[PDB]
Design a protein around this ligand. Structure first.
Ligand SMILES: O=P(O)(O)O[C@H]1[C@H](OP(=O)(O)O)[C@@H](OP(=O)(O)O)[C@H](OP(=O)(O)O)[C@@H](OP(=O)(O)O)[C@@H]1OP(=O)(O)O
Ligand SMILES: Nc1ncnc2c1ncn2[C@@H]1O[C@H](COP(=O)(O)OP(=O)(O)O)[C@@H](O)[C@H]1O
Ligand SMILES: [Mg+2]
Ligand SMILES: [Zn+2]
Length: 390
């Protein structure tokens, strides 16, 4: 089953992260109706020598022919054993022509954030792509959430100066630095600690915060069509205008105050799904925080630790720690998609069926332990610094 230059006409922009573009099928084929295609971007072979060393315990993973089988097996072999297979769909292998990739790249350039184009195009060196269900299909209202990390570190390896790292969420400390680099306009109201808190009340607080300031953490589609949140990027606060048209968009679906109810019914969904519980235990596979795990990284890549207990560990442990760090990084950066067509909305007294799905599940590259460390370092220095302003 191979896609050619012709079929580039049957797929249309759904959005992108840093690593991937996502098209939704607008054609007529019964093999792609209700599918998306996830295409890897190339910034400006499957696994490095170091990574092969680190994923050694993984027969199939290490042997994948391309990246797409690589993603396919990562999700299926390493992630599904953890999150569980009602909410994760690893999604199928699909061959594509290099000419199919090119025209797609050209075709949707116009629909992308410019800074996203400055950074990467699609990788036209690929012969392949992954096809996943379109979770915005089930009148389907579909909500995407990018919860980020919903706990605080407690690590012995977090030094005296950085101990704020143990009091203040990474999300909130990062909001300040994103501002500094004009990547967001205002600070986000959302707080993942409320979402992963597990309190029914606080989970709603977070859904509210997400509506006000969605940034790249909140999206809502109807019929697979964006009606709140940025496209391939973050987005500024929800103004009364923005809200007005949203309320109007909820016309019909909800019977009502249509916005107040949407939130309530998204919140009831999330909390009664309990799906944030598992994810949180996976995020917690970061047992030592980057400031601990970074030392394990250097032994693993056979390199004198520039940062210098941890180094006297058996290699089997050092490897585990790194593996676990990166599976964690996968859970910290993934998204939940909730579909609506159970939740019973009190006022109107309606009833909604729902499905929840994890998406944006991606293998983190091992070499990224270094950027992780540098980003983290920069985060806490800028926070500590803007805290001296007192
Ligand atoms: O480009 P952004 O919208 O700012 O998002 C990126 C995220 O992108 P995705 O939504 O595409 O997953 C990065 O992942 P990559 O696609 O670049 O690989 C991720 O990087 P890591 O998962 O490796 O951490 C990073 O997360 P973070 O900032 O927590 O390191 C996160 O940025 P934000 O979530 O902060 O916006
Ligand atoms: N299976 C899916 N169904 C519906 N929409 C999706 C699906 N996968 C991704 N999307 C949309 O496309 C966007 C980008 O996809 P994603 O896989 O998160 O890219 P990246 O890995 O680079 O972050 C997401 O924000 C999401 O809104
Ligand atoms: Mg990704
Ligand atoms: Zn060290």
């Amino acid at each position: 089953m191979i896609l050619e230059e012709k079929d580039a006409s049957d797929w249309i922009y759904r959005g992108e992260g840093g690593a991937n573009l996502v098209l939704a099928y607008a054609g007529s084929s019964p093999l792609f109706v209700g599918k998306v295609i996830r295409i890897q971007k190339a910034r400006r072979s499957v696994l490095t020598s170091d990574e092969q060393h680190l994923w050694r315990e993984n027969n199939e993973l290490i042997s994948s022919p391309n990246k797409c089988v690589l993603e396919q097996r990562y999700v299926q072999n390493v992630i599904i054993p953890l999150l569980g297979p009602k909410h994760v769909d690893a999604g199928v292998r699909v061959s594509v022509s290099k000419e199919f990739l090119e025209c797609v790249d050209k075709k949707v350039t116009k629909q992308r954030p410019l800074w996203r184009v400055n950074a990467a195009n699609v990788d036209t060196s690929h012969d392949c792509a992954l096809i996943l269900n379109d979770h915005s299909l089930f009148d389907c209202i579909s909500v995407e959430i990018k919860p980020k990390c919903g706990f605080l570190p407690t690590s012995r390896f977090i030094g005296k100066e950085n101990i704020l790292k143990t009091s203040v969420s990474r999300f909130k400390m990062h909001q300040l630095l994103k501002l500094e680099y004009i990547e967001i306009s205002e600070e986000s109201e959302y707080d993942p600690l409320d979402l992963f808190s597990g309190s029914k009340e606080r989970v709603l607080e977070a859904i509210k915060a997400l509506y006000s300031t969605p940034q790249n953490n909140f999206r809502v589609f109807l019929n697979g069509s964006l009606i709140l949140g940025g496209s391939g990027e973050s987005t500024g606060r929800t103004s009364p205008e923005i809200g007005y048209a949203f309320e109007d968009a909820l016309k019909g679906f909800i019977q009502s105050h249509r916005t107040e109810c949407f939130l309530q019914l998204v919140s009831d969904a999330v909390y009664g799904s309990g799906v944030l519980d598992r994810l949180l235990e996976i995020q917690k596979l970061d047992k030592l925080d980057i400031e601990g795990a970074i030392h394990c990284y250097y032994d693993i890549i056979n390199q004198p630790c520039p940062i210098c207990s941890l180094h006297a560990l058996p290699l089997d442990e050092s490897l585990k720690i790194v593996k676990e760090y990166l599976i964690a990084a996968t859970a910290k950066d993934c998204s939940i998609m909730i579909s609506f067509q159970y939740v019973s909305l009190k006022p109107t007294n309606q009833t909604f069926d729902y499905k929840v799905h994890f998406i944006d599940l991606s293998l983190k590259p091992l070499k990224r332990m270094e950027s992780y460390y540098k980003l983290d370092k920069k985060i806490i220095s800028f926070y500590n610094r803007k805290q001296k302003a007192e």
